Design a protein around this nucleic acid. Structure first.
Ligand SMILES: [Mg+2]
Ligand SMILES: [Mg+2]
Ligand SMILES: [Mg+2]
Ligand SMILES: [Mg+2]
Ligand SMILES: [Mg+2]
Ligand SMILES: [Mg+2]
Ligand SMILES: [Mg+2]
Ligand SMILES: [Mg+2]
Ligand SMILES: [Mg+2]
Ligand SMILES: [Mg+2]
Ligand SMILES: [Mg+2]
Ligand SMILES: [Mg+2]
Lengths: 92, 95, 85
DNA sequence: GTATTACACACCATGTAATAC
DNA sequence: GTATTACATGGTGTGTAATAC
């Protein structure tokens, strides 16, 4: 599952060039790890760890999934052809 | 997509254990290895081996393959630009 | 199977000897022999050389060796007492 | 031109046990 | 108690060179 694109510019900056301007300072490594996990997994189910609280997003955007970063904040992405296209950092 | 930082999986695990409130010693006893071993793993001083990956998956979830794949991408990053491949021919006809 | 078998497949189908493969990727033919026969592991540094010679990515080659390592370890480690957080 | 393998050797993961905080 | 790490060790990948064709 390779990552192909992003919606939250703030994540793309940390993933591509390694710049923390668009993410909270305390959450930098935690997000960098979850992203490395999303890029490394061959299929959803390798991203099913209890700490992630991985659940699908249904009704609106069926096929998109949600992983938890800390407390409320979450990382949301679409899964297609064994890959992960859109990548966003938001709440619920 | 060329991630800029590729962390050793041990260091990722260490962060998760901080986030889960699990000590090295508790982790060791759970997965069946010595605290020495956990320390070196978590510090990124030693590799996540196949046999560790079996134990870790049982405690932390995902599959052993996932854990080993993290270690491989990491091993590869460190080896980037350390091996001259410029003289190796790519066997086969050009597409 | 050992990732050796797949490499052997590529070599035979491409008419490349072990000895010429070794010289191309920068290791001794002894090393290619042992690799192909599955006596030794496809290491990360070999995976970089093999990808340059045969194509695909080093990750792909390493993944074959990992699946193999795991298969050999099957039912050898008691995880029954490990708690899943 | 080709392949296989005993040997010596170097590296690395792991267990034990000493030790700083 | 918790974590770290020197040390001894065992396992294993590699080159050299012999042995084969
Ligand atoms: Mg990937
Ligand atoms: Mg090391
Ligand atoms: Mg070619
Ligand atoms: Mg050992
Ligand atoms: Mg000992
Ligand atoms: Mg100390
Ligand atoms: Mg000391
Ligand atoms: Mg070894
Ligand atoms: Mg060596
Ligand atoms: Mg020598
Ligand atoms: Mg002999
Ligand atoms: Mg004979």
């Amino acid at each position: 599952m390779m990552i192909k694109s992003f919606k939250h510019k703030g994540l793309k900056l940390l993933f591509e060039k390694g710049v923390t301007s668009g993410v909270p300072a305390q959450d930098v490594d935690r997000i960098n790890d979850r992203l490395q996990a999303i890029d490394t997994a061959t299929e959803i189910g390798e991203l099913n760890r209890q700490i992630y609280k991985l659940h699908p997003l249904k009704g609106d955007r069926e096929g998109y999934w949600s992983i938890t970063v800390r407390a409320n904040w979450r990382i949301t992405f679409q899964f297609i052809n064994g890959d992960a296209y859109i990548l966003n950092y938001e709440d619920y | 997509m060329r991630q800029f930082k590729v962390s050793h999986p041990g260091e990722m695990i260490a962060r998760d254990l901080e986030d889960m409130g699990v000590s090295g010693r508790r982790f060791a006893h759970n997965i069946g290895v010595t605290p020495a071993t956990v320390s070196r793993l978590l510090a990124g001083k030693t590799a996540l081996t196949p046999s560790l990956s079996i134990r870790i998956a049982a405690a932390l979830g995902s599959t052993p393959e996932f854990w080993l794949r993290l270690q491989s991408n990491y091993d590869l990053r460190q080896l980037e630009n350390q091996i001259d491949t410029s003289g190796i021919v790519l066997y086969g006809e050009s597409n």
